[PDB]
Amino acid sequence: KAVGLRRLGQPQPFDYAWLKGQARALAKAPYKSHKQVLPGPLESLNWDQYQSIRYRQDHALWADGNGKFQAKFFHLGLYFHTPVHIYDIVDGKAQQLAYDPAAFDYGRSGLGGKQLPKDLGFAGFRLNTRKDTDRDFSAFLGASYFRAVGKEGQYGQSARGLAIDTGTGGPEEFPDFIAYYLEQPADDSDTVVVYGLLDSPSVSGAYRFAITNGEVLVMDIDSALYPRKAIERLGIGPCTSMYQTGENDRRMDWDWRPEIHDTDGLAMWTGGGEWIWRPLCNPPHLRFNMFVDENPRGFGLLQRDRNFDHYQDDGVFYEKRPCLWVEPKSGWGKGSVQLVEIPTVDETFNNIVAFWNPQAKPQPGQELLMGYRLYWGAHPPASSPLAHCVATRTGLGGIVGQKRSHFSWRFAVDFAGGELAALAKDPKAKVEAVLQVSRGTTEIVSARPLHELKGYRAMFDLVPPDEGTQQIDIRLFLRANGKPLTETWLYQWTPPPASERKIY
Amino acid sequence: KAVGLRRLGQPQPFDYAWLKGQARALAKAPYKSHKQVLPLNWDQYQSIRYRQDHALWADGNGKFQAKFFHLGLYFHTPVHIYDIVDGKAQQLAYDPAAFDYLPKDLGFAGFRLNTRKDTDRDFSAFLGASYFRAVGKEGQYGQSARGLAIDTGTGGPEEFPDFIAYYLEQPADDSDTVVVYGLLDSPSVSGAYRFAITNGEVLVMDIDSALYPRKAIERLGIGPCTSMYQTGENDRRMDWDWRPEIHDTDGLAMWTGGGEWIWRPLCNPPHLRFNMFVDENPRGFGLLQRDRNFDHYQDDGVFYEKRPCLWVEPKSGWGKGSVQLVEIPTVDETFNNIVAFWNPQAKPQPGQELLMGYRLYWGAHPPASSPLAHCVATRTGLGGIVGQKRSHFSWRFAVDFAGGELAALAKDPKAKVEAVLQVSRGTTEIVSARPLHELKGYRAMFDLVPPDEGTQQIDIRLFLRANGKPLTETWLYQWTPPPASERKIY
Ligand SMILES: OC[C@H]1O[C@@H](O[C@H]2[C@H](O[C@H]3[C@H](O[C@H]4[C@H](O[C@H]5[C@H](O[C@H]6[C@H](O[C@H]7[C@H](O[C@H]8[C@H](O[C@H]9[C@H](O[C@H]%10[C@H](O[C@H]%11[C@H](O[C@H]%12[C@H](O[C@H]%13[C@H](O[C@H]%14[C@H](O[C@H]%15[C@H](O[C@H]%16[C@H](O[C@H]%17[C@H](O[C@H]%18[C@H](O[C@H]%19[C@H](O[C@H]%20[C@H](O[C@H]%21[C@H](O[C@@H]%22[C@@H](O)[C@H](O)[C@@H](CO)O[C@H]%22O)O[C@H](CO)[C@@H](O)[C@@H]%21O)O[C@H](CO)[C@@H](O)[C@@H]%20O)O[C@H](CO)[C@@H](O)[C@@H]%19O)O[C@H](CO)[C@@H](O)[C@@H]%18O)O[C@H](CO)[C@@H](O)[C@@H]%17O)O[C@H](CO)[C@@H](O)[C@@H]%16O)O[C@H](CO)[C@@H](O)[C@@H]%15O)O[C@H](CO)[C@@H](O)[C@@H]%14O)O[C@H](CO)[C@@H](O)[C@@H]%13O)O[C@H](CO)[C@@H](O)[C@@H]%12O)O[C@H](CO)[C@@H](O)[C@@H]%11O)O[C@H](CO)[C@@H](O)[C@@H]%10O)O[C@H](CO)[C@@H](O)[C@@H]9O)O[C@H](CO)[C@@H](O)[C@@H]8O)O[C@H](CO)[C@@H](O)[C@@H]7O)O[C@H](CO)[C@@H](O)[C@@H]6O)O[C@H](CO)[C@@H](O)[C@@H]5O)O[C@H](CO)[C@@H](O)[C@@H]4O)O[C@H](CO)[C@@H](O)[C@@H]3O)O[C@H](CO)[C@@H](O)[C@@H]2O)[C@H](O)[C@@H](O)[C@@H]1O
Ligand SMILES: OC[C@H]1O[C@@H](O[C@H]2[C@H](O[C@H]3[C@H](O[C@H]4[C@H](O[C@H]5[C@H](O[C@H]6[C@H](O[C@H]7[C@H](O[C@H]8[C@H](O[C@H]9[C@H](O[C@H]%10[C@H](O[C@@H]%11[C@@H](O)[C@H](O)[C@@H](CO)O[C@H]%11O)O[C@H](CO)[C@@H](O)[C@@H]%10O)O[C@H](CO)[C@@H](O)[C@@H]9O)O[C@H](CO)[C@@H](O)[C@@H]8O)O[C@H](CO)[C@@H](O)[C@@H]7O)O[C@H](CO)[C@@H](O)[C@@H]6O)O[C@H](CO)[C@@H](O)[C@@H]5O)O[C@H](CO)[C@@H](O)[C@@H]4O)O[C@H](CO)[C@@H](O)[C@@H]3O)O[C@H](CO)[C@@H](O)[C@@H]2O)[C@H](O)[C@@H](O)[C@@H]1O
Ligand SMILES: OC[C@H]1O[C@@H](O[C@H]2[C@H](O[C@H]3[C@H](O[C@H]4[C@H](O[C@H]5[C@H](O[C@H]6[C@H](O[C@H]7[C@H](O[C@H]8[C@H](O[C@H]9[C@H](O[C@@H]%10[C@@H](O)[C@H](O)[C@@H](CO)O[C@H]%10O)O[C@H](CO)[C@@H](O)[C@@H]9O)O[C@H](CO)[C@@H](O)[C@@H]8O)O[C@H](CO)[C@@H](O)[C@@H]7O)O[C@H](CO)[C@@H](O)[C@@H]6O)O[C@H](CO)[C@@H](O)[C@@H]5O)O[C@H](CO)[C@@H](O)[C@@H]4O)O[C@H](CO)[C@@H](O)[C@@H]3O)O[C@H](CO)[C@@H](O)[C@@H]2O)[C@H](O)[C@@H](O)[C@@H]1O
């Protein structure tokens, strides 16, 4: 039977307006690092020691009550040298939770009998239903990172509170959540509300996360930001994923597993009403791309291929990993969805980052309010009502069985859904591939039924305009009678250098 | 309505003994070339179409007919075609009335056979040198057979026999079989063949051959299967194409005289590889297209997943010899870069008569396979624990098996299944055998550390075992390790 948790200090009145006040005040002073040298035995644990530490079910927050949820806490150490102070809100008042050795099984860490302060803090927290106390439906841990899962329960990509100067070629600035306030839900509530205080060299913030667990998990998020400095590249709603290899891009096809990625595309629903699918790549050099928009309806990183046959990893279940969809609340005005793709040689590094960059540079003293909903699960809650891109495949161009007189690259793009089944069965149906390329030229263009999918396949060869490796953008959709039949496929290709072209 | 075909000369008595007689006399005399200067793009060649009004047997009441290929393009060796009726052969003339666009004795390039019900579908086609093809139910042409291979994969020049005449025996009206006789000639050898062809879901050819060496032969190949393997999970060295699997066949299957079932995955190696599997009284061998899932191939024009498996079953005990496999590097699917055949231990000698009979099966599945679990996938890549510094180069293999009693073992937490793994050189590490529930089978994984910096072929033998007995056919993989320069990049 669970016990009450050890506390620190007395309850203090708490609400979102109060937290926005703390964050604004925090931005009025220069940034001071929150990283600490931890007490001696804690400062240099190894992986094995750290991993053996376990938070005890009998000290899980709220598990002594009658509600549907509970929380457990991650211990500091190993990677986590920035204390996070955790508070419980009851009747409108926030009480800090003490670091309590009785709440941990220390395993092989050697931490028992050390004299660790009551104000040590934590590394983060995780939430669990009371019906299923070993399953984490969300986990907030490290910097401003957090993750959640839907029904399938397999962890994959991450979100963050905020991204700053990702992919600039210069150094990235990583904000931290330095405090979390967990609001005790009503006994019959399906929601857990968590508040977060964020600080970073450039900016402070106050965050409210209303987390509703479900088959697709939803978080209703409000953020109030208070810059301390001008910010070159602010990133709202950042999604953080990994793409090593797959049909979209076989450059790093060194593995026996054919698809290795936590997500395979960036999806966008534009203010103008367009649906876009942008297949993720693993490029040879860092690539930064922006998609200009105004009042965006949504963007996110999806794991659209959910067929185990294409992944084959019965250890980590890539095909079950969640989509993450960002849905702006209200109008965010002008800006761009931005995508950073970093080269990676393996699947241990998150080489994909996507976020929203406002047009206007934030300025010291200003308040910036940004709200959105995040959906985690097998499918985003919104998608194109037209046919979706269900596969992208590429390879060396040129008519098979003829001499090849020049370098080109071949693309095959498969669409299914909407009304393509009926069109594919109509021998008179005329479907037009619509192609626009940033540079270079297309040849051997076709759009034809793909009966095996009850869909359509577009194929084209792309001839780069020169011997250089400047990125080439291709926009493709299918159409009939004044209406698009598909969402828009937007691919960004880094041509090979002349030396590689010569081998071909 | 179809008309009778233009003839040439008068019917002469014909039987198999006569044909054997013509072949042996051909072989005793000096070889005379049959390539002729004929009295043209690949696209431009098909303007020529043999017409149905002139199709052989289309004016009768039987189940089958023949039409003929025109000499041209890749075909400059005339084939004389004959119709056998009541024990008598009569040559068919070259007739311009029979084509849609030249002497009566110009000859043809070969023939194709059709049911009367589907006169545009051909279920067999004999065309080019001694090559021929057939299809089963799915109708999609793929790998080829030949009458004979000579000096394939020697590092010297190959010699390619020609069928120089075919005698088509008019079937009885209710027969399900077409019998075709072939006269083969080649610098080294002449032959008389009999092909009993029985169309069906899996098409069967019952073949008898009688071979007369004109001179000693260095490498005789009997029952040759000729295929293509560009890229796929077995070997992604040439992964240039958007299509992930490109091959007419994915493995060599062998049923040995001792009763072993072997699956040898085909590769597209960087240099020619010649491999032999010593056997005695082989029970069968062939090239299979075992992966039949369109999803893995994606070509909705030529349907690699529907192409036929070719299985050879000797009608008798062929004694000692070897199944031989030749793999040639290719950068495209148009080159036939895979050849497998039986090579008898004994060197053929001038004056001798070699009688060899066998059955060929063309269709979706071989008519025989292991009753144990099959290898249903081979995948390979860079070895080493993922995301760790590597002290040494290694290559990782994942091999999936399904069938036999593996589904029951996979569900059974008490089940003790072990991978048994031998390599001809180097060492193996990080070896496992575990249920693959998504398949209801097992997966074996291992890493292989090549012994040195060089690229000498390594042979790997794998099977799964419980209580001392095999649970699977034998997986036999021949790996060419990458050179040092490639390892540095890894
Ligand atoms: O083929 C191949 C070739 O090719 C070429 O190229 C080309 C190309 O082609 C390609 C393709 O293309 C395509 C195209 O495309 C396009 C696209 O399209 C798209 C689409 O769209 C479209 C649309 O469409 C539509 C449709 O409509 C259409 C129609 O249709 C129809 C159909 O019809 C068809 C037909 O059908 C039929 C069939 O059957 C048949 C068959 O056939 C087949 C074939 O076969 C062939 C072959 O092949 C093969 C091969 O193999 C072979 C061989 O050969 C080889 C050689 O051999 C030799 C030997 O060799 C040896 C060696 O020796 C040597 C040496 O070596 C050495 C060694 O030794 C050593 O060791 C080493 C060391 O190291 O060294 C070395 O060196 O050397 C020396 C030197 O010195 C030498 O001398 C020597 O020789 O050795 C070795 C070792 O030992 C060995 O192993 C070897 O062997 O030798 C010997 C002795 O001497 C000799 O004799 C031999 O010869 O070799 C050479 C060299 O290398 C090579 O090269 C060769 O190759 O031979 C042998 C013997 O004889 C044999 O046996 C074998 O087999 O190969 C492979 C492997 O590798 C295999 O696999 C194969 O198979 O070949 C031959 C020869 O040539 C011939 O004859 C034959 O024929 O094939 C195919 C393929 O695969 C298949 O498929 C088939 O099947 O045949 C038979 C006979 O046999 C007969 O009988 C039968 O009949 O099929 C079916 C099924 O099965 C059936 O049923 C039928 O019947 O067909 C045809 C043909 O193909 C076609 O054409 C047609 O089309 O039909 C159906 C039913 O009925 C119907 O329904 C339909 O309708 O049609 C029309 C008319 O035409 C049209 O017009 C129309 O279009 O429709 C459908 C339904 O509805 C729908 O869906 C659709 O859509 O349309 C529209 C309009 O409207 C349009 O616009 C449009 O476009 O669509 C789709 C869907 O969606 C898609 O997918 C597609 O894509 O498009 C695009 C745009 O967008 C474009 O761009 C494109 O182009 O198309 C077209 C029409 O369009 C087509 O035509 C074409 O095709 O493609 C593919 C892929 O995918 C590929 O693959 C191909 O290639 O094309 C182009 C264009 O046109 C052109 O230009 C040209 O050219 C190449 O050139 C060549 O090369 C080859 O050959
Ligand atoms: O493999 C498996 C398979 O089989 C099959 O069956 C088959 C068979 O096989 C078998 C084998 O056989 C062997 C033999 O043995 C036997 C014997 O024989 C005999 C004969 O008789 C026969 C007949 O004949 C005929 C002929 O024809 C031939 C040819 O001729 C040519 C010529 O030359 C000649 C030679 O031959 C001789 O020898 C000599 C003498 O002096 O003379 C000469 O002249 O030349 C010309 C010019 O150049 C030409 O034109 C011709 O063609 O040759 C070939 C090659 O060598 C041979 O083969 C043949 O035979 O012709 C003649 C005329 O000249 C006539 O008259 C005769 O008649 O035929 C029949 C049918 O028609 C049959 O039936 C019979 O048999 O005779 C001869 C004489 O002439 C003698 O010499 C011989 O010896 O017989 C016996 C009794 O009957 C028996 O028993 C045996 O068997 O031998 C041969 C020779 O040496 C060889 O070659 C063969 O191979 O045997 C084995 C045992 O070991 C077995 O196992 C097998 O089976 O064969 C047959 C024949 O060819 C056929 O017909 C059949 O078909 C089956 O069917 C399946 O199923 C299986 O799988
Ligand atoms: O963004 C979308 C989501 O919005 C959520 O709703 C939010 C709401 O966002 C609005 C936004 O609100 C802005 C605000 O305009 C309000 C106006 O505010 C007056 C305020 O009245 C509020 C009250 O304020 C208390 C005050 O807290 C403020 C805090 O004070 C500091 C204190 O914390 C500190 O200790 C000391 C010492 O350092 O300094 C003080 O300055 O400072 C922060 C940061 O600046 C402010 O955000 C806090 O308001 O503290 C004093 C004590 O010091 C209290 O006496 C006072 O009550 O708080 C109430 C909740 O407790 C709240 O309901 C009241 O609105 O009062 C101050 C004076 O005290 C006055 O100057 C503000 O103008 O209120 C009117 C209602 O009459 C609203 O119509 C108006 O929108 O202005 C502040 C200051 O500039 C902004 O920071 C704030 O963003 O306005 C947007 C329109 O432009 C609107 O679109 C947003 O929805 O903000 C409130 C307040 O922060 C939140 O409580 C609320 O949750 C929705 O719930 C989501 O669904 C949306 O997605």
β-partners of residue A194 are A182, A209
Q: How far is A484 from A431, CA to CA, in rounded Å?
A: 10
> DSSP strand E in A176-295: where?
176-183, 191-200, 203-212, 217-227, 234-241, 243-245, 260-261, 265-269, 275-279, 287-294
B16 lines ligand 2 (CB under 6 A): yes
Distance of CA A62 from the midpoint of ligand 3 (Å): 30
Question: Topology of domain B7-363, per CATH?
Answer: Beta-galactosidase; Chain A, domain 5 (2.70.98)
Scanning A184-294, the segments in alpha helix (DSSP H) are none
Residues of A in CB contact (< 8 Å) with B are 247, 250, 253-258, 308-309, 312, 314, 346-348, 393-396, 400-401, 410-412, 450-452, 457, 504
Q: How far is B430 from B245, CA to CA, in rounded Å?
A: 28
Instruction: Please state the separation of Cα A199 from the chain's center in Å.
Output: 20
Distance of CA A376 from the midpoint of ligand 3 (Å): 30
Closest CA to A435 of A471, A404, A475: A475
Q: What is the residue whose two structure tokens read 């209406």?
A: A483
Report the run of H or E that residue A51 belongs to, with start and end: helix A47-51
Q: How far is B396 from B391, CA to CA, in rounded Å?
A: 15
Residues of chain B with CATH 2.70.98.10: 7-363
B206 lines ligand 2 (CB under 6 A): no
Residues of B in CB contact (< 8 Å) with A are 42, 233, 236, 239-244, 294-295, 298, 300, 332-334, 379-382, 386-387, 396-398, 436-438, 443, 490
DSSP assignment, residue B174? Answer: T
Beta carbon pairs, A and B, within 8 Å: 65
Q: Which residue in chain B has the smallest CA separation from A398?
A: B241
- Answer yes or no: do B298 and A253 touch at CB < 8 A: no
Report which protein residue has its CA nearest ligand 3's atom 29: A21
Q: What is the residue whose two structure tokens read 């009304």?
A: A419
Chain B partners within 8 Å of A253 (Cβ): 236, 239, 381
Angle made by CA atoms B307, B313, B319, in degrees to the nearest 5:
140
Q: How far is A395 from A413, CA to CA, in rounded Å?
A: 12
Nearest Cβ partner of B300 from A250, A253, A452?
A452
Q: How far is CA A102 from CA A52, A85, A378, in A?
A: 15, 18, 38
Question: Topology of domain A7-377, per CATH?
Answer: Beta-galactosidase; Chain A, domain 5 (2.70.98)
Report chain B's C-alpha Rg in angstroms: 25
Residues of chain A with CATH 2.70.98.10: 7-377
Residues of chain B with CATH 2.60.40.10: 374-489
Q: How far is CA B392 from CA A347, B208, B382, B431, in A?
A: 20, 54, 11, 17
Residues B150/B188, Cβ–Cβ less than 8 Å: yes
What technique determined this structure? X-ray
Residues of chain A with CATH 2.60.40.10: 388-503
φ/ψ of B314, rounded to 5, equals -60, 135
Distance of CA B141 from the midpoint of ligand 1 (Å): 10
Distance of CA A249 from the midpoint of ligand 3 (Å): 48
Q: How far is A106 from A116, CA to CA, in rounded Å?
A: 13
Q: How far is CA A158 from CA A289, A349, A376, B167, in A?
A: 20, 12, 10, 72
Q: Which residue in chain A has the smallest CA separation from B398?
A: A256
Residues A305/A268, Cβ–Cβ less than 8 Å: no
Q: How far is A376 from A395, CA to CA, in rounded Å?
A: 33
φ/ψ of A177, rounded to 5, equals -75, 120
CATH class held by domain B374-489: mainly beta
- Write the residues followed by a gap in chain B (C–N more than 2.5 A): 39, 101
- Answer yes or no: do B243 and A393 touch at CB < 8 A: yes
- Spell out a b/e string for B163-197, using b for 16 or more CB atoms within 10 Å of the CB, else e: bbbbbbbbbeeeeebbbbbbbbbbebbbbbbbbeb
Q: How far is CA A155 from CA A137, A146, A308, B65, B421, in A?
A: 9, 11, 16, 63, 35
φ/ψ of B167, rounded to 5, equals -115, 105
Residues A322/A157, Cβ–Cβ less than 8 Å: yes
Question: Topology of domain A388-503, per CATH?
Answer: Immunoglobulin-like (2.60.40)
> DSSP strand E in A257-396: where?
260-261, 265-269, 275-279, 287-294, 298-302, 323-328, 334-341, 352-358, 368-377, 388-396
Q: What is the resolution of this structure in A?
A: 2.2
φ/ψ of B5, rounded to 5, equals -95, 150
Residues B48/B100, Cβ–Cβ less than 8 Å: yes
Q: How far is B412 from A46, CA to CA, in rounded Å?
A: 37
Report which protein residue has its CA nearest ligand 1's atom 6: A401
For CA atoms A164, A167, A171, A174, give the dihedral sign.
Answer: positive
